[PDB]
Each structure stands twice: as structure tokens, then as C-alpha cells.
Design an enzyme around this catalytic site. Structure first.
Site, PDB file in Angstrom:
ATOM      1  N   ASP A   1     -47.004 -33.707  44.755  1.00  0.00           N
ATOM      2  CA  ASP A   1     -48.347 -34.247  44.620  1.00  0.00           C
ATOM      3  C   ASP A   1     -48.781 -33.561  43.325  1.00  0.00           C
ATOM      4  O   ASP A   1     -48.985 -32.350  43.291  1.00  0.00           O
ATOM      5  CB  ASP A   1     -49.243 -33.815  45.773  1.00  0.00           C
ATOM      6  CG  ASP A   1     -50.613 -34.450  45.700  1.00  0.00           C
ATOM      7  OD1 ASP A   1     -51.066 -34.734  44.574  1.00  0.00           O
ATOM      8  OD2 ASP A   1     -51.244 -34.656  46.757  1.00  0.00           O
TER       9      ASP A   1
ATOM     10  N   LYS B   1     -58.544 -36.577  37.550  1.00  0.00           N
ATOM     11  CA  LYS B   1     -59.070 -35.354  36.967  1.00  0.00           C
ATOM     12  C   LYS B   1     -58.845 -35.131  35.470  1.00  0.00           C
ATOM     13  O   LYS B   1     -59.818 -34.940  34.731  1.00  0.00           O
ATOM     14  CB  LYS B   1     -58.565 -34.129  37.755  1.00  0.00           C
ATOM     15  CG  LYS B   1     -59.036 -34.050  39.210  1.00  0.00           C
ATOM     16  CD  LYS B   1     -58.284 -35.039  40.083  1.00  0.00           C
ATOM     17  CE  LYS B   1     -58.717 -35.003  41.550  1.00  0.00           C
ATOM     18  NZ  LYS B   1     -57.544 -34.918  42.420  1.00  0.00           N
TER      19      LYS B   1
ATOM     20  N   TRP C   1     -54.612 -29.578  51.167  1.00  0.00           N
ATOM     21  CA  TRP C   1     -55.669 -30.568  51.049  1.00  0.00           C
ATOM     22  C   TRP C   1     -55.658 -31.351  52.372  1.00  0.00           C
ATOM     23  O   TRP C   1     -54.717 -32.091  52.664  1.00  0.00           O
ATOM     24  CB  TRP C   1     -55.343 -31.468  49.862  1.00  0.00           C
ATOM     25  CG  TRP C   1     -56.269 -32.602  49.623  1.00  0.00           C
ATOM     26  CD1 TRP C   1     -57.615 -32.539  49.436  1.00  0.00           C
ATOM     27  CD2 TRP C   1     -55.895 -33.969  49.412  1.00  0.00           C
ATOM     28  NE1 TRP C   1     -58.109 -33.779  49.109  1.00  0.00           N
ATOM     29  CE2 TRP C   1     -57.074 -34.678  49.086  1.00  0.00           C
ATOM     30  CE3 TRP C   1     -54.678 -34.663  49.461  1.00  0.00           C
ATOM     31  CZ2 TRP C   1     -57.075 -36.054  48.805  1.00  0.00           C
ATOM     32  CZ3 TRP C   1     -54.675 -36.028  49.183  1.00  0.00           C
ATOM     33  CH2 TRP C   1     -55.869 -36.708  48.858  1.00  0.00           C
TER      34      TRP C   1
HETATM   35  C1  LIG Z   1     -57.632 -34.923  43.796  1.00  0.00           C
HETATM   36  C2  LIG Z   1     -56.301 -34.806  44.598  1.00  0.00           C
HETATM   37  C3  LIG Z   1     -55.405 -35.929  44.702  1.00  0.00           C
HETATM   38  C4  LIG Z   1     -55.594 -37.306  44.102  1.00  0.00           C
HETATM   39  O1  LIG Z   1     -56.829 -37.922  44.354  1.00  0.00           O
HETATM   40  P1  LIG Z   1     -57.373 -39.075  43.476  1.00  0.00           P
HETATM   41  O2  LIG Z   1     -58.700 -39.643  43.814  1.00  0.00           O
HETATM   42  O3  LIG Z   1     -56.886 -39.961  44.566  1.00  0.00           O
HETATM   43  O4  LIG Z   1     -56.378 -39.796  42.607  1.00  0.00           O
HETATM   44  C5  LIG Z   1     -54.241 -35.723  45.430  1.00  0.00           C
HETATM   45  N1  LIG Z   1     -53.899 -34.536  46.041  1.00  0.00           N
HETATM   46  C6  LIG Z   1     -54.755 -33.453  45.943  1.00  0.00           C
HETATM   47  C7  LIG Z   1     -54.281 -32.180  46.649  1.00  0.00           C
HETATM   48  C8  LIG Z   1     -55.942 -33.609  45.226  1.00  0.00           C
HETATM   49  O5  LIG Z   1     -56.750 -32.514  45.161  1.00  0.00           O
END
Ligand SMILES: *Cc1c(COP(=O)(O)O)cnc(C)c1O
Ligand SMILES: *Cc1c(COP(=O)(O)O)cnc(C)c1O
Lengths: 396, 396
Positions: free
Chosen positions: B211, B246, B130
């Protein structure tokens, strides 16, 4: 790895709360904290806010992400509140606003923005000032300097000393100003002193940063903003970090905003992109609920009328307690004069008590105040005004 | 001052959204974004969440500040979800949890905590990963290194290469692991590979940072956590940054958590104080609404049953679309094999499309995907599956 991490020092305000936990004495009186209390000694949810949360509950159809800068309505309604409906700053699109997690959040965002996109190295904060100010800026790698402000002897703004310490500030330095209801002295500049500071500011080439966390608690919404509006009339660039924690009673929903003002829209839009970048790597996007409520109230005529009235009731109760406090002190035969607290604004005022008197009030009377002598007037009610005052008279 | 600030580069995902704004073509198909969509193509509020916001609206009596680490209930309910109800980590009080503004917020907090209280200098993230991962850590002054992970040719986890690049990692370095539903490959380790990594980790002396943003989207709540639980069984210290954006559909309420685990309670409590200090100078305290909802659902038996079922419906719909996607591709006579996407988990998968094919799909078919070829399976419905697949077959 966490082998020998040293314990963090106790916070000057938040840590004071714990002492209240252990103390089991009944008659305790909490004058530290930092939030509003009503006659009952509670911190209720405004009616306007409940009605707003009602609306949101029946209309929200998604919890999909807000843009990095938050709700667009929240933004313009905030700029109108700060600069005025017909403000030239808005007409020329010279300002951009990012919804932030509280006023503290707006400060960190501003600090990160400045430390990574400008030549800023120093920030000037008043002496005394809300302790968290220095911490937030140092955390961003900026050094914090102090300028005279409070006249401990006359319990007033030492305008001269103020001006004399600001001269040591170079062009390009940031100077932080409390919009109204200065924390913790409660002493604000007069309109003429504000104008004098706005001019001096433009000459020296300082970057003004207003911390506006109590708009509506001094004289009123519009009145409390003439200071900031005086600067905005003569300045090319500004930064305002505002909060809705207090005037909306939305403390835990973390509702604030960081407004950036530049010479033209072309420039502000460019500077703002970097500010959005600073936010992207912090919390990504702001929480909606709290800001959603504010926007709903401010954009609805009916609801906005109810809120304004509720704000006024809060302002006047504090003004009440300030008078009831001074008088009762005389009635109990207090040592010297305390009339200066009726000249101060907002929830806070320096009582002029020594560290030892504060310590004695707490240990022998369950009366809790910050070691600095700062007392939260909003923590006084007609019920505790007598036991409170009697204890104070005992330590004078 | 903001004279010559340079414009910030467009975000690899958030900027893609704008292109959708301008494009006025009707049949557009958004496979970028990053949130869940239902058969309708909407991102609704869960029923369990609406019922929870109902409850909060009738019971909340104050919006007074939450402690720096947020709601205590939110904390333990989170630790039980991560480590298991009878987890030894909880019994020995080896873990502390701070409610944070989203999963991204938990990452920044962890990064600030590490850069100011440890000797950590490098963080290892998978390749690919990410994009925001590198940004958050660099923002905190840590350098980010990469380790092999994805086998572009076989569309699988290249375990060997993974292990071979991690050897270059010294003791004291932080290694980041996606708990489940790896973003963006969608390829996760097997339980045996997890155990092998947990051992190798303890030997090399790495600090694991998980994470965990999609718990419940791979196989289930408990199943998706065996990886993290395998590490937690052998590790003295850990850091988990989790999100509820999510699995609760609470994206804009910014609901996440940063959990710290140490050898004993004595140590974790000490390390945690510094973590609270890092939060104090950032946003001060977390927003309540979003976290309040989660705690209410998780601690109520009835509501928790409804939510779990809703989570399951989300998981299965994605598993549905993965199958419906592969089959339709064959039906439309797609060039090569795409069966590998049925082996991947979560909302994301690499389509294996070239930058140019992505560019062609968008410009000639209104089909939107990330330049990397990442597609959000949750953006596919039975309605757009045919027009979508046909366009893909056109660029092969
Ligand atoms: C969606 C995601 C998050 C967390 O995002 P939120 O809006 O902040 O809580 C963290 N790491 C990855 C890889 C994600 O896809
Ligand atoms: C209360 C206050 C703020 C803002 O705090 P919030 O929780 O963050 O929004 C900022 N500055 C001062 C001086 C304050 O007293």
C-alpha cells in the site's frame, strides 16, 4: 500464484472495439460503441460543460475529500430532476442520494447494499437487457432471473408475456426497470402500462430498481420521468440508479447517482448509513470534477438553459437519423419494412438482422454492429447513411 | 424491505469530523482528518495542478470513455515512478497497471481480483494499521490476520516480534506492507530490514501487497521506493496499490492505481484480464480528470519540476513541525520525552496519549485527535503550536 489464471471472456461490446482497431479499411462505420456522435462523427464536450469547467478552474481552492455521499448540491438537484421540484418525496425527506462513479457504479453500490443489508436473493431483468446488468448483480452474489419483454416478431413490447413471467416473482424480489430508452430494444412502456406496472408492483410486494441512464433522450426531461414518478407515487421504497454520462457527455468523468427512497426520513437515514458503509469499503468517496460540473450547470439558470438546448439538439438529431435511416432503406429498395425503428426511443434499436448478416456486414462492408443486431442510431450521419444502407440491402 | 436495517457504526476517522461540526468553540485544533495543511491551515490546490487543469481545459475535445484500465500514459509514468526508469520489470513487460478511483479503490480492486481468481484466503496486516484495511478485505470475503509491528514501550519497530508472528503465515497468504510513512505509527523498516523481509518473503512463499499512499513524504520519491524495489528485485509476483491523493493534493478526484506484476508478460496479461473483469462489474472505467492531470505533470519536464519542488515543500514543512512540536513541549515543560516523533515519518505519529487524555484534550481544549492517540502533524502550524502544546502538558 497467478500461475493458471484463465483468460477472461471478451466483453460483448467493449471487445467489439478492438476489431475496429485491426480493420484498416477506410470507409468503416462504427454502430456498436454506445456513445453519442454528432454530424461530424465526433463525441464533443458540451459548451455548457466547458463553461462550467472554466468556472471550477477559477473558483476551486481545495481538492479536499467530499463526504462519502458526494456533493450535497449534486444530490438535491438530482432528486428534483427525478421526482419533480414539488415532489412529496423531497418535502418529507424520504430520499437520500449518493454521488457515484457512473451509473454502473450506482448499480454496484445498490447491489452491495442489498446483498448485505436485506433478504433480497433474486433480481429480475428484462430479456433482452444491457448485458452488464446480470454481471453486476451476480458479482454481488444475487441471482438474476429474466422476464419476457421484447416481441421479436412484431418489434414491440409484449405486455402480456411481460406480466405473465413477473407473476413467478415473489414478494421481496427486486425487479429492474429501464426508466426510458430501453437498452437495447429501444421500446418503453406507455404511461398507462407504467401505471399498471406500478400497481401490480405494490400488490406483489416487489422492490423496484430503476436504471435511468438516458433521461432526456426519449421525449424530454420531465416526460422521460413519468414512468419512475408513477412508481414513486405508490411505492414506500425504491432505488434509482441514474447516470449523467449521456445527457451531459461526461462519460469518462464517471458521474452517476444512487438514490434511496423509504417510507419516512427516519428509516431512509438508517438504511442510507449502511449504503455509505458499502461505499466506504469500495472507493471511499466519489470523484468531484464530473459531479461538480453537473451541479454547477443545474443550479445556474443561464447555464442550465444552454445545456437543455444542447440536450434537445442531441435528442432531435437521433430522431432525425431514425427517419433518414428508414427512408434511405426504402430508397435503396430494402427487402422488408423497417418503420418500427421510428417507433423506438434513444440511441439503440434492434435492426432485426441475423447473427450471420451482422457478421457479413462487418467482414464484407466494414459496417460494425453488435452480434445481437443492436445498432447505435447516433452513429449514423447524412454522410454514411447511403453507404450504410446499401450494404444492409446487400445482406437481406 | 428496509424495515429493520441497523444503523452503521461510526467510522473511526470520518465520524470524528462531525464532532468538529457541533463544537462551536473558536480555538479548535483539528489533528484528526488525514490530509495536508499549510502554514495557513488550508489544503490548497498545487500550482502545478492548476496549470495542468488549464492545459486540459484548452486541449480536451471529448469526454469519451477511457479503457477499463484508464489512461495508458498514466500507467507507464506510474510504473517508472514505482520501479525506476530502467527497471527490468518494465523492460520485460512484467507489469500491468490499472488506473483506479483512489488508493482505496486499488485495494478493493485487488481484493476482488484475489478473492475470485486465486486460492488466497488470508491477508496479513500490521498491528496497528489504517483501520480501513481490514474492512476492505473482509468486504471481499478474505479473512484478515495481524502481525506484531509496533513496540508501544520504546516507540519503535519491534522487528523480532514482527518476524515471529509472520512465521505463522503459510505459503499462499498475502502480506500487506506500507511502502513508506506507515499509517499510523509513522515507523518504517530500514533498507536492511526491507531486504531481510524480501528474502524471508520469497522463502515462505508469501504474496506481497504494498500500500503505497505517501511516496515522497518520507525522504524523497526515489528513496521512499527502495523498500518496494527491494521486494520487486526478488519476487516473481507482486501487487502495488498506490495513491496520488496526497503527493498531488488530489484527494477528491480519486486518483490511484493498482499495478500487477507476474513472472512474464504472457502471464501478467492473462491475470490482468481478470482484473479488468473485476473492474468492469464495479465502476466500469476510471474518472479521467484526476489521472489526466497527473499524467500531464509527470510527462512534462517543466511542470514535473514545479510539482517535485512543491512536494519537497510539503515534506519539509512536516519535518519542521515535528521538531517545533517536540521543542515546544519541552519549553512548556512537558512531562516525559517525545523525541521519538522526530524519528517517525509522514503526516502521522502515535502521541502515546491515553484514550482518556485524548478525550480530555478534546472536551476541555477543543484539541481533536483520534482516540488511538494518532495525531496529524501536518495539522500543526507555528500559530497553534503553543496553545496545542500547553493543553497537552495539562493532561500529562
Ligand atoms: C490515504 C491512504 C490510502 C489511499 O487513500 P486515497 O483516498 O484512497 O487514495 C491508502 N492506505 C493508507 C494507509 C492511507 O493512509
Ligand atoms: C450507459 C448505461 C448505464 C450507465 O453507464 P455509465 O457509464 O456507467 O454511467 C446504465 N445502464 C444502461 C442500460 C446503460 O446503457
Amino acid at each position: 500464484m497467478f500461475e493458471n489464471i484463465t483468460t477472461a471472456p471478451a466483453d460483448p461490446i467493449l471487445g467489439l472495439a478492438d476489431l475496429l482497431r485491426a480493420d484498416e479499411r477506410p470507409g468503416k462505420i462504427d454502430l456498436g460503441m454506445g456513445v453519442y456522435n454528432d454530424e461530424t462523427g465526433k463525441t464533443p464536450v458540451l459548451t455548457s460543460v466547458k463553461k462550467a469547467e472554466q468556472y471550477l478552474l477559477e473558483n476551486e481552492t481545495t481538492k479536499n475529500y467530499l463526504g462519502i455521499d458526494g456533493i450535497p448540491e449534486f444530490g438535491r438537484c438530482t432528486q428534483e430532476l427525478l421526482f419533480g421540484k414539488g415532489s412529496a418525496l423531497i418535502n418529507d425527506k424520504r430520499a437520500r442520494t449518493a454521488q457515484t462513479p457512473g451509473g454502473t457504479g450506482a448499480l454496484r453500490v445498490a447491489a452491495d447494499f442489498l446483498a448485505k443489508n436485506t433478504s433480497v436473493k433474486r433480481v429480475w431483468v428484462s430479456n433482452p437487457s444491457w448485458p452488464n446488468h446480470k454481471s453486476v448483480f451476480n458479482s454481488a452474489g444475487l441471482e438474476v432471473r429474466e422476464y419476457a419483454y421484447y416481441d421479436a416478431e412484431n418489434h414491440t413490447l409484449d405486455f402480456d408475456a411481460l406480466i405473465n413471467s413477473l407473476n413467478e416473482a415473489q414478494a421481496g424480489d427486486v425487479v429492474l426497470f429501464h426508466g426510458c430508452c430501453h437498452n437495447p430494444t429501444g421500446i418503453d412502456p406507455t404511461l398507462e402500462q407504467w401505471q399498471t406496472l406500478a400497481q401490480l408492483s405494490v400488490e406483489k410486494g416487489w422492490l423496484p430498481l430503476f436504471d435511468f441512464a438516458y433521461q432526456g433522450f426519449a421525449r424530454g426531461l420531465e416526460e422521460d420521468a413519468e414512468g419512475l414518478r408513477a412508481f414513486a407515487a405508490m411505492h414506500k421504497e425504491l432505488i434509482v440508479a441514474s447516470s449523467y454520462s449521456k445527457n451531459f457527455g461526461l462519460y469518462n468523468e464517471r458521474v452517476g447517482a444512487c438514490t434511496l427512497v423509504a417510507a419516512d426520513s427516519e428509516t431512509v437515514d438508517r438504511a442510507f448509513s449502511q449504503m455509505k458503509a458499502a461505499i466506504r469499503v469500495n472507493y471511499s468517496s466519489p470523484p468531484a470534477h464530473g459531479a461538480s460540473v453537473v451541479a454547477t450547470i443545474l443550479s445556474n439558470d443561464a447555464l442550465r438553459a444552454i445545456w437543455e438546448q444542447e440536450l434537445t439538439d442531441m435528442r432531435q438529431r437521433i430522431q432525425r437519423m431514425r427517419q433518414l435511416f428508414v427512408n434511405t432503406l426504402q430508397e435503396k429498395g430494402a427487402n422488408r419494412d423497417f418503420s418500427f425503428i421510428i417507433k423506438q426511443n434513444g440511441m439503440f434499436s434492434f435492426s432485426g438482422l441475423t447473427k450471420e448478416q451482422v457478421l457479413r456486414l462487418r467482414e464484407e462492408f466494414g459496417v460494425y454492429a453488435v452480434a445481437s443486431g443492436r445498432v447505435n442510431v447516433a452513429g449514423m450521419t447524412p454522410d454514411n447513411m447511403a453507404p450504410l444502407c446499401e450494404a444492409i440491402v446487400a445482406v437481406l
